[PDB]
């Protein structure tokens, strides 16, 4: 029923991987500060 993906791709600009990035390490840095929090102790 649904045409193949190739038919959706013809006649339109392709999908682009926009706003590329890499892990800032922020979360794991914040996580280390929270070793003995009320939730980590319980």
């Amino acid at each position: 029923p649904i045409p193949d993906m190739s038919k959706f791709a013809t006649g339109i600009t392709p999908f682009e991987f926009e706003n590329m990035a890499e892990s800032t390490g922020m979360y794991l840095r914040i996580r280390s500060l929270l070793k003995n929090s009320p939730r980590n102790q319980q």
Binding site: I2, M5, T10, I12, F17, A21, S23, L34, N40, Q42
Partner: protein, 694 residues
């Protein structure tokens, strides 16, 4: 009158299970029901706890490679089922997609899944990470874009997981959501995760009708932590139990609560009572950003944190904003929240700087915030429950009238009480400031969740893209929408295909304006509209082809485009220099003509209303931002919340990317470079600071 040629042929089979969950399966009526078979091989994933009955049942569906809707309370552990599908997909060297309705939630889910599977990526309208990952977390808008563009990323996808499908309507992604389900190939299988909904069977029947395969329904009302519901009448001194652990309404205590009748200070009293009784952590739900900030500031007399907890807050807070520039660290909102957080008092609403909202989420999720004053959106956050949930008001305003909150809203918010493991009970407290009957009180506190109803409607981008693609047409998506399926089931025997009249009128507009030929073949102008989804694709393309953007600088165009993504209905109009009021008048003239064409095409539309939807209250804010001002500066130019400014800026950046693709579709490198320059001029600093979850 347009009658359907082929109607749904679906039957539902009940499947007996051990106590504690319901199992049904919708399947093609012509096929024989085949029970599921035991897992062949090892479990794709193992857990360090005993799975509940409904989880085992859902997991067996995945082991048999059959789609499943899991409808259960948030807290029952639906994510376990998604984790098994991801694990199985990676073991089989397949790709799997996990979609959320909101970008903020996708960021949280990316962290959760990355910490569990590592081989995870993220794709939103604000960031792309590890796009070759086996497991891709993304928003439903991204998935729609990949499908309409035939992205090869979809060829290896074996499983798609839709999270929180009951929230798609409120999230604004109601149409996008059904489009992705309708456009996915039939070889893909699904895990739908939903809150408890009364029409789960209906949804599975639709999926079965759509993809000609069985779709299971695993449903349970199970709550690992039982709740107790109290009413705190205005002026009263204590709490009145109105629904006990077993779900029995207490009509005696209810009237006794109304007896006390027959609110800043009241909020402080009740909160203080909660803290003295060790009912914290507490989430205080208010349906207004301002109420959240006011109530929070009334708690400044109190201090909930230990010295060791203050240090943790301070350290986390400084590490979080350390990514900001020294100019943005000094923003008033930044300096205003930290004294609260140190005292265990938090705030969470859309008006907040995203970096602070994420900081507050992480703090509350780790127990460093004992009293969080939040709007309804916080209930959709992942793994952030409390011991107590407090409702400051039983009524809200849905842009129409003061109505009591629905049972579904109460269930969604009240369901964040009760932390599994450390709470034996969950406490829910409903503040009531006026008279209310036992009937509606029982409906509110004991009524069932709201049904999941289709939000599908036609859009020009949808119609044009389906005209464009060969071997499919707009009529196909209409007949296969859940909106159409709900009609079939609500009125048995009816074959009328709804929305056809609207489809014809909308195509007349497209013809009369050169988007498509009389024979419904798409023009190059239409292919430009196919690139624009987040805003009025018709008007923006007409503006492009009339040249409105050619005489504008990047800053002017960027500022003018803010009128297409700004959505606040209670702001004061600023004064615009001719550099902005000029382009604004050109856009409005064009909008008038489209309104005229639409009316003549026999679409219901009001010219003034249509012109009013393009709100220019931030044109100057955006213009000055694009010309290099600081965020602190532009906040002084408006009463709009800082977080609402950033939300508009982020949707503006998303629209600009679509305008680049629009110009690119006709090789108009002039506008492409112009729209791209606007992006470069707004994508900086706290407004586009990275998510703390990355």
């Amino acid at each position: 009158l347009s009658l359907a040629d082929l109607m749904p042929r679906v039957k539902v089979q009940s499947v007996e299970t051990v106590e504690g969950c319901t199992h049904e399966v919708a399947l093609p009526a012509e096929e024989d029901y085949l029970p599921l078979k035991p897992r062949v091989g090892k479990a794709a994933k193992e857990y360090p706890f005993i799975l509940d009955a409904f989880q085992r049942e859902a997991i067996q569906c995945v082991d048999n490679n059959q789609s499943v809707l899991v409808s259960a309370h948030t807290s029952a552990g639906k994510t376990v089922c998604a984790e098994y599908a991801i694990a199985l997909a990676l073991r089989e060297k397949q790709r799997v997609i996990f979609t959320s309705p909101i970008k903020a939630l996708s960021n949280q889910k990316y962290r959760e899944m990355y910490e569990e599977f590592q081989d995870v990526g993220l794709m939103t309208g604000d960031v792309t990470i590890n796009p070759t990952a086996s497991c891709l977390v993304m928003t439903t808008e991204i998935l729609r874009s990949m499908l309409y563009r035939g992205s090869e990323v979809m060829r290896e996808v074996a499983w798609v997981i839709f999270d929180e499908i009951h929230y798609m309507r409120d999230s604004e992604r109601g149409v996008v959501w059904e489009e992705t389900i309708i456009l996915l190939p039939d070889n893909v299988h699904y895990v739908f995760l939903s809150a408890t909904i009364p029409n789960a069977r209906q949804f599975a029947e639709w999926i079965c009708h759509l993809h000609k395969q069985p779709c299971h329904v695993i449903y349970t009302d199970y709550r690992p932590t039982p709740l107790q519901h109290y009413i705190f009448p205005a002026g009263g001194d204590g709490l009145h139990l109105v629904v006990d652990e077993n779900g029995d309404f207490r009509e005696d205590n209810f009237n006794t609560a109304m007896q006390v009748l027959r609110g800043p200070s009241n909020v402080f009293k009740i909160v203080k009572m909660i803290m003295e009784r060790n009912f914290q952590p507490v989430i205080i739900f208010s349906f207004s950003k301002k109420d959240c900030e006011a109530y929070a500031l009334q708690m400044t007399k109190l201090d909930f944190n230990t010295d060791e907890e203050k240090k943790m807050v301070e350290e986390v807070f400084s590490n979080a904003i350390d990514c900001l520039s020294d100019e943005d660290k000094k923003l008033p909102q930044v300096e205003h929240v930290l004294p609260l957080l140190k005292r265990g008092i938090g705030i969470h609403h859309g008006g907040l700087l995203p970096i602070l909202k994420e900081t507050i989420e992480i703090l509350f999720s780790e127990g460093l915030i004992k009293a969080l004053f939040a709007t309804e959106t916080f209930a959709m956050g992942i793994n952030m429950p409390a011991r107590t949930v407090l409702f400051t008001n039983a009524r809200k305003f849905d842009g129409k009238d003061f109505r009591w909150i629905s049972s579904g809203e109460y269930i969604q918010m009240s369901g964040r009480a009760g932390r599994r493991g450390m709470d034996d009970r969950g406490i829910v407290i409903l503040m009531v400031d006026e008279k209310m009957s036992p009937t509606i009180g029982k409906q509110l506190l004991k009524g069932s969740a709201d049904p999941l109803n289709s939000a599908f409607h036609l859009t020009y981008n949808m119609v044009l893209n389906l005209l464009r693609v060969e071997e499919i047409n707009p009529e196909y998506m209409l007949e296969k929408s859940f909106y159409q399926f709900q009609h079939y089931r609500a009125i048995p025997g009816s074959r009328t295909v709804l929305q056809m009249d609207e489809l014809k009128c909308r195509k007349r507009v497209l013809r009369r304006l050169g988007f498509a030929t009389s024979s419904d073949v798409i023009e190059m102008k239409g292919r430009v509209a196919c690139e624009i989804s987040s805003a009025d694709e018709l008007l923006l393309t007409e503006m492009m082809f009339n040249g409105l953007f050619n005489d504008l600088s990047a800053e002017q165009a960027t500022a003018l485009l803010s009128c297409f993504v700004f959505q606040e209905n209670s702001s004061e109009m600023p004064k615009l220099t001719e550099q902005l009021a000029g382009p604004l008048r050109q856009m409005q003239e064009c909008a008038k003509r489209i309104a005229k064409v639409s009316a003549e095409a026999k679409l219901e539309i009001d010219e003034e209303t249509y012109l009013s939807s393009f709100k220019p209250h931030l044109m100057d804010v955006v213009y000055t931002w694009a010309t290099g001002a600081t965020f602190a500066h532009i906040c002084k130019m408006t009463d709009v919340f800082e977080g609402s400014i950033i939300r508009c800026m982020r949707r503006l950046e998303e629209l600009l990317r679509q305008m680049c693709q629009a110009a690119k579709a006709i090789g108009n490198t002039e506008l492409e470079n112009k729209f791209a320059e606007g992006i470069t001029k707004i994508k900086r600093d706290i407004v586009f600071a990275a998510s703390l979850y990355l």
